[PDB]
Amino acid sequence: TLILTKNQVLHCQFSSWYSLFRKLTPKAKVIKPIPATVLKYLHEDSIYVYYPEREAIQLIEKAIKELGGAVVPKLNWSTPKDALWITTTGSLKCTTAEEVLLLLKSSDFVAHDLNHAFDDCKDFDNSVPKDFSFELVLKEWFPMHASTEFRCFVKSKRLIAFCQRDDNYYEFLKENIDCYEKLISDLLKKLDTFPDPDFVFDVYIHKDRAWLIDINPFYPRTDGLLFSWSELESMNSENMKPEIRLIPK
């Protein structure tokens, strides 16, 4: 019953919401459109240990320098969180263009952005829409406490649910859940310019400050984590309290 439109996917591109919410979200640079030689390199399906032209490499490392020397890369929608297995350090942290490119090339999520981004859109048959372009996003890296990140579900512009984003129990959350809820609620009021009524936003809350991390479609390809999409779909938006789930001890 839940359907996904082309516009819903387009509205969640990093460039589309970073613009809206620059004051709420960690610093980032966007290279758009993505350099063609970079795009060409990212489609390689090699497993063993071509390369973009120097101009692209310098452009990327200019952005890295400007962000303080360490970044997390992504394309329009997906962060290559799945591709930690290929990094020499086990981290999303990239300090050179080589590291950025290796991480992006090895991600299933990134590959999904590149080849299948609009395949679930009922109003778009398949290939990409007019006036669309891929973009290379370099987010400033910062160490973040995995257990104070949340995924927050919005339906008819109301917060119906949110959950802990990682999978480790963290007792501090239980004692402080009303504080987290208020900060998430307050952030959602500041997302008033987001154009769709239903969506999913990720937040990092640190020292009483909420940071917007990502916005994704209200659709089962967005991991529901501690919620199932069956319950998210049926959940009533008129409730005055959101459902809150944390990892059990």
Ligand X SMILES: Nc1ncnc2c1ncn2[C@@H]1O[C@H](COP(=O)(O)OP(=O)(O)O)[C@@H](O)[C@H]1O
Total residues contacting ligand X by CB under 6 A comes to: 18
233 is in an annotated binding site: no
Shortest Cβ distance from residue 55 to ligand X (Å)? Answer: 25
107: contact with ligand X by CB under 6 A: no
Residues ≥6 apart with Cβ < 8 Å to 72: 79, 92, 93, 94, 138, 139, 140, 141
72: contact with ligand X by CB under 6 A: yes
Strand partners, 121: 4
Q: Which is nearer to ligand X, 57 or 212 (CB)?
A: 212
Q: Pairing between strand 158-164 and 243-245?
A: parallel
Shortest Cβ distance from residue 224 to ligand X (Å)? Answer: 13
Other C-beta atoms lying within 10 Å of the C-beta of residue 50: 8
Q: Which is nearer to ligand X, 55 or 68 (CB)?
A: 68
Rounded to an integer, what distance in angstroms lies between the CA atom of residue 100 and that of residue 70? Answer: 10
Shortest Cβ distance from residue 169 to ligand X (Å)? Answer: 17
Q: Which is nearer to ligand X, 141 or 153 (CB)?
A: 141
Shortest Cβ distance from residue 93 to ligand X (Å)? Answer: 7
93 is in an annotated binding site: no
78: contact with ligand X by CB under 6 A: yes
165: contact with ligand X by CB under 6 A: yes
79: contact with ligand X by CB under 6 A: yes
113: contact with ligand X by CB under 6 A: no
Residues ≥6 apart with Cβ < 8 Å to 64: 70, 71, 94, 95, 96, 97, 100, 138
Q: Which is nearer to ligand X, 123 or 204 (CB)?
A: 204
Stretch touching ligand X by CB under 6 A, among 42-50, 56-64, 115-123, 210-218: 210-218
Q: Which amino acid is at 189?
A: K
Could you say which residues in the range 132-151 bind ligand X, by CB under 6 A? Answer: 139-142, 144, 146, 149
What sections of the chain are H helices per DSSP? 6-11, 14-20, 36-42, 54-66, 97-105, 108-116, 172-175, 177-189, 229-234
247: contact with ligand X by CB under 6 A: no
Residue nearest to ligand X (CB): 79
79 is in an annotated binding site: yes
The one-character DSSP state at 35 is: P
Q: Pairing between strand 136-140 and 71-74?
A: antiparallel
Residue owning tokens 């529901």: 224
229 is in an annotated binding site: no
140 is in an annotated binding site: yes
174 is in an annotated binding site: no
Compute φ and ψ for 199, nearest 5 degrees: -165, 175
Residue ranges that bind ligand X, judged by CB under 6 A: 26, 72, 78-79, 81, 92, 139-142, 144, 146, 149, 165, 202, 213-214, 216
